[model samples]
Target: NKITPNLAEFAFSLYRQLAHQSNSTNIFFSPVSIATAFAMLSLGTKADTHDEILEGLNFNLTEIPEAQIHEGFQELLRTLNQQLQLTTGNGLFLSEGLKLVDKFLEDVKKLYHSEAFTVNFGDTEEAKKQINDYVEKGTQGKIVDLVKELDRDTVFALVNYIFFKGKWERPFEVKDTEEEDFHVDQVTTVKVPMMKRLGMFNIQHCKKLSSWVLLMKYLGNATAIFFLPDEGKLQHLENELTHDIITKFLENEDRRSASLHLPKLSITGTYDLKSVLGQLGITKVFSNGADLSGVTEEAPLKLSKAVHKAVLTWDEKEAAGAMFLEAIPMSIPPEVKFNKPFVFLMIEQNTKSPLFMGKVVNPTQ
Candidate 1:
């Protein structure tokens, strides 16, 4: 759990960078997946490649030893592996006849739970099939074509993937889901069904962002926190938000008895992490002059591409939303609706670290 705070810190930095370039669009990416991938990749790198990955992930290398960092992630993943429908892993697809370092191969398998595969890049079709099939099986068929195509010039592929399909603890019934027009800038209205539920939830009023933070629980102790900012407060929220502010909301939320409405959430993202990490000072590993000698004994070797793909979806359990009779009848309660844009964080309770997070600017298709 020592890693949670630093992980959250890196999550915000990654989110800020993506949000800045996104320009008010719906933002979605798996921070945990990215962090895990780069952290593991650092094992096969040296000097700049290794340090940039760790430091870029918000770890103060000066304070925490590098070995301890990997140990933390190992423990963190072990905790998350127990959660329902949380399928996450790493794979190293090597070029055919490539010689790998036994040390890296051993460390990656032991610390990151990674599997190694050998494929001939010249045989693009079969290589793609092998990579895609492994990922498809890893995600339980949720991501079938994760590797759509691979060029023959590519020598190796390092893939990190995460897929979570979960149900709410107190889910909303399908009959209560209403089709509503979600207003976007008063000019664009989208017809999206809002899942309606009348129940008690833990919420907080974040004065810093001028946002209302709503926390909803999942069946497996995972929780989703949603932030509904007062109109036009997104700029400040995106600029000023950090792990510290999020911690305040989680620690001091008040239980609110109210009616809640949420849009169906299903999101996926495919990222070219090589460029993304390049911006984060992780350039050496991808540069032609890079030194990844720790991974394999090959000349003129560097990471051609780092691919990341994540899938998160919500599915309701049968009859799980039925109202319980243990409620205390009260006067009128406030109605909190996320008919518009909002930010969301899905946190795993065991480690108290964010699992997958993003903002839903336009949930309607």
Candidate 2:
């Protein structure tokens, strides 16, 4: 069976967990990037570690064959890379002289498209540089210093990152941008340069969550969905977020002229995967009881560092893309102002995979 549905479920679960910890702060993450790395690490894991990692990603192994899972990811990545500027990268950084299973290395390279690098872990500074350098290049220098630091005893490090470069299909002219008030809270407000779009776009209203879902198409096989909850209901919408509810909104959408006002988008999300995984009940990989024999010849070896970094930055005319443009304007295409906190998700249009998810509290932040 395909894994897109499972990945969608895991995406919602991850967003909720991350949201719980951050409370009211702006949040951003890539479930696709994280899940792919975890699946790659599973090749080195055995017994409970293997099972935990797979299950943690919401895969029912009992029902879907194990080989199919890897095959599914292979197909998934290949399809997504075919179009768009989205890039998901995986790296397996191993200590010098460490010997990993030949089959595991080949599988990771073939399935998850991971690159294995042997580095001297004792030289923490050097190792960090090499890892960070790779990420910087992979993200086209948009993400730097991803490997903040590494422990000396670190036998291996697994890192995953995703970068997307795309522009709005319906370009937002720089001339329409203006300063506006953004409600940060009940009594607090801040001024932001709100980008305006006056054209026909897809949108839906949901009385269930007292919110509106705005669908904005990008230049490629992706779409940006903005979830704006009504006043006093930001938390409520987050609490009610689920794969089905989001599906409900996506399936039922209408295109109409809308006076859309949103802050110029700029955000970054960095997460420590160790803590995040532990909270998700995938704990065996970090402890001595872990079984990772499938990875290397070294015994008593446990995961050293598992970090995930995602960066998303785009302005309406960032690239001035799209081969087609139109102008028909609107009557009173229902003015929709995102003057308050909101959640946004960027997903692969054809696959429906969550490439990036986050909330925006302070645009300038």
Candidate 3:
């Protein structure tokens, strides 16, 4: 991926701010998702129909000056994806189609009291059925129930995260899934689902990094990393977790281990991203400093607020999700189990930098 420093910094800022402020509740997508939103934000503000939305999503019309929306949306997508290296592939194009319509309909409903421009499933049952169908198709059957329309179009943009954290190279048997008491604090405990696995594999403890552990599972070009923070050292670990630190950990990991106890968890989080992001250091996109000049030269628009509701459900099996975010200046993190309440992030297996991060203890208000 052709990632630029600005994109790296922006992605870092988005997830880290949440870590800094301890906003650990709902599921949030990486700037990857927002990249889609920026396409929508940059295009939908001026888009008239499905074709216009596609044009914005694909960056199809940039040369001809016939449609001003094309230029801006093109600018927005190019600048944002330049850093993240996200291609305008079949999957992303489909995501753009759904997310833009979802977000645009929401913005108009909230700001203009109009419903003609966006999607609002009027009946709850039918809307639910439709959304279920969409999600099943989106994830190729790996994910389901990604979006749910309650009763009216009063709200939109609901992204769901499903993560299944299994063992490293050693596969954990379902028979080993047992009950364990998780430490809530110093004295409180909650019964949590735990999975155990036994096998020879790669496991490394970062003594220099303190309270940090890296576990890897490889499959072709794809891999998964289980980053566990030491007991009672979540805060310190989070503060110490940087792109460089992650780079170092992956560089030195030793592919040898004995036993692993993989925990199975599915945390459901839902909230409005506007306040959370504002709390994290992205006020520019929502304020006059908003630099979406690519979408429109003089449209004078700013993201009022982003209503992002995500359900991050994970287990000792697999991980999948869909969440909303503002494009270009945001990143996503993963979940790491810490001693006290702390932050965990998901990073590309090769890149070392975080794909996204979440502060579990303080996820929402």
Candidate 4:
């Protein structure tokens, strides 16, 4: 399947916003997953609310028909769902006694592969457990207890979960992993187990931001690309980073002999997307005046909460590897060390679609 820029662009934009807001904390998310949930929800919106959701997703109404959008999503989901190791799910839990538009529910079930359930928000505790349990099973326990609690008056909840674990095509030796200092910022450093590898890799130097972008292939169809900024240039790189910049690195074919050092990482991010979506011109969905009539003509349906949770892990045991090969330096391999704050992306090799995008400002966080 050809890669669509809209999804990748949307992911990059969201990542940039999150990075700005989280100046010191680590950031990791599956934008494609979140966007898919919203796209499915869009099938149940009407009037300005519907338009807002589409625009918020960077979908231009004039160029794309509503059915076309949903069908495109169908194809995209089919492509992604082919990966067995990558698990994704979306659930629509409605308050008891709420009747939704039949066509809308059918579209969600068919196109999005989501199931609709009628849960009584009156029993808040039970509802929370049911939703959390579903998410835990969906993400294969990487994310447990997704919903801590729910409001008694809550009418709707949309949950999206993406869990991915892939090993390096060429794994790092466990003995070579060592505890080293990782600079969180200019003023702080913390000890982290840094994994090491020395070999030929696809790398590029972005002179504009004084950063080295290295692409490391995973054992499967995915690849992890790391952007290691110069000691104090993390901010500059972050500010200048965009979809185009990332595309350049992905399209780049420069291969170099280099020594790579990356932190052995296990990171999780859970976000309450109400404010984030509101900030993106989706104000009407959460208000009383909002028009979700397509979902239910009986009572106006408003999104109470839009939640996202994701977990990413990389370790030696995830997959086995052959012995590291010795590299003969043609000239001198540029050493690319992610010993400081930097950005990373897990992308599909063929489409260059970003599956997970994040920043590691502080691994310990």
Candidate 5:
């Protein structure tokens, strides 16, 4: 398949965002797997060249412990779909593309939680540590401990995938962090977990249709765009979160410096998305009848679900951490109050080009 300038542009835009998001974090993507996934999502069918697709293809992450490997894949697939939906929300449907995603997920099922999927390590704390150390090294200290269990030990050297790891740009000190109020929405308040950092940040205010946007960035150089809505206009903020609007906002982002007062936050989120792709102009990659004959010319294949699940951990040494996907702004953060459910997107169109894209919503939250 010849990559078009338009598709290349989108890919590049996604990559820039992913790079920025990973500035203080780690992100891993199986180029072949994701390419296959993308192709399936784009063409709505499996690659006809199964032998070509499988030949000489390797994830080369054998040193990682089994548990971590499983965790990485789960996080990647789940998050991929979430971000896809984030980019393409709004009652959109991509049944065929989604079906292809389902097929991809199903075929990779053997790699899920299987100890045989990882390299062997003796069942010992020191051995575990050694394996974890290798994982850390492979990911540049982004991944440390591995959840060692029976299954993890059993699966070794038989998986193909990707791992992403990253840390914050400027880590926050525990002494400096204190509890504070967070506005989940206009009328509600949530005193959930919050981390504070008094660092130099990119701060500015903008006028959007629905809110007074106060965008801030961490010392890590990762940005946080807080949409401080007018009294009783949060729904408006959401309504304005369209792909075109987001793309323009990001591209036109102003840069300055300010006293950054940020909150600490941590939350685990997951969503199964089969329809988001269609909304993002990627309608072929997930359909059952779609074609991915580009990847392999030998057999017909279909991707089930581009399953993605991720974990984010933040602390002093680490400003932020993510197993799969990045904010494209490097590192990560929170809070001006998000009581109500909100959406986010993390894009990585960079593997092949720069980026001219948006995830539609912040999938990390």
Candidate 6:
């Protein structure tokens, strides 16, 4: 069985937990990118440390062999790298004096497609700029200053980036976009430029949660899916989120022709994931006695910090329609208005793997 699905499930679970904590804020991150970074980190670990890292990533070592896990990641990277518009990168910046195991380095290259660089962490300022520059370049400048500071005693750092830019398969006419009020909550409202489109779309109504799922395709094989819960129902749906729920929303074939309205959104989200990972039972890696010997042998190493930054811009020219749905006998297409907060995912076209998952509580932010 392919591990991609398993990883996707784990990604959604992580997102659900995160959303539960930050329900009121705009959220976004690349789960695959973060997971790949940890998977690469797992390469240099041993015994309990190795097991803890894998488990934190929601993997069962006994069920899925280590070789298979790496193989799966290699296959994913190979396929996604073919997309010119999508740039994904992984790298390791080691302390100048740190020595690495040859096998560990080779495995990271072959499996995660990562390169290792030695930088003098002793020069905190220069090292900070260098690592940040690598991330900025890796994401094609979508993200910048990813590393805000370097711990003076830091020995190694791991980084990953996934950036994508693509137009909608069926573009929303610019003339149709206009300022509209988006309800942030019961009493708060903000004016945003809402883009409108009338086309056949993959849509479904989840009666259980009183919401709608909209799947919008990109010009390429990728897609952006949204879950718009009815007003006053956002929290209910959020609490109900799960991998199975999201999968059903994506796979449900309730096709229809509709007039859709959505805000043109641009968001940048940064997270310090240390507490989040610990909440998910990944404590051993962050403890004082933490064993990250796989990464370094000079001194006992532990994860000092885990940071993730993501950028998303959703507004562009129109294109052809997605799938066709027979027009219902009516004077107008059924309307699906996104005038409030919602959840969304940007997924690979062929594999349906999640690239980014987020909550759009406010468009202006």
In angstroms, the error of model 5 at 60 is: 34
Q: Give the residue spans of candidate 4 off by over 4 A.
A: 1-3, 317-327, 330-332
lDDT of 1 by residue, 77-149 (tens): 7877764778888788878677888998898888988787778888888888888889998887888788776
Alpha carbon deviation, residue 320, candidate 5 (Å) = 14
lDDT of 4: 0.80
TM-score-wise, the better of 4 and 6 is 4
Off by over 4 Å in 3: 4-8, 23-31, 39-169, 218-220, 280-302, 309-343, 350-353, 359-365
Q: Where does candidate 4 clash, by residue pair?
A: none
**Positional deviation of residue 34's Cα in model 4 after best superposition, in angstroms:** 1.0
Alpha-carbon deviation at 295 in model 6, angstroms: 2.7
| Candidate 5 lDDT, 1-365, residue by residue in tens | 12222333333333344544433232322222333333222222334322222121221224433234334444444433442211111111112211223433443443332121122234445444555455455445444453242232221111122332223444555676555555543465545444555333333344665553443323322333444555566446545554344344444445443333344433332222233333333434344454555333444444333332233333443334433332343334332333333323332432221111122122134
Q: Clashing residue pairs, candidate 2?
A: none
| Predicted structure 3, TM vs. truth | 0.56
TM-score of 4: 0.93
TM-score of each: 0.94, 0.94, 0.56, 0.93, 0.42, 0.91
Rank by lDDT, descending? 2, 4, 1, 6, 3, 5
Pick by lDDT: 1 or 5, better one: 1
Cα RMSD, model 6? 2.7
Measured on C-alpha atoms, candidate 6 has an lDDT of 0.77
**Model 2 misses residue 87 by how many Å?**
2.9
What lDDT tens digits, residue by residue, belong to model 2 across residues 132-212?
Answer: 998889887878998887887898788888777667776778888999999878787989889997877777787887888
Q: Which one wins by TM-score: 2 or 5?
A: 2
Cα lDDT computed for each candidate against the true fold = 0.79, 0.82, 0.43, 0.80, 0.35, 0.77
Residue runs of model 1 more than 4 Å from their true location after superposition: 316-329
The regions of model 5 sitting more than 4 angstroms off are 1-36, 40-171, 181-189, 198-200, 209-226, 241-261, 267-269, 278-288, 295-300, 314-365
Give the C-alpha lDDT of model 5: 0.35
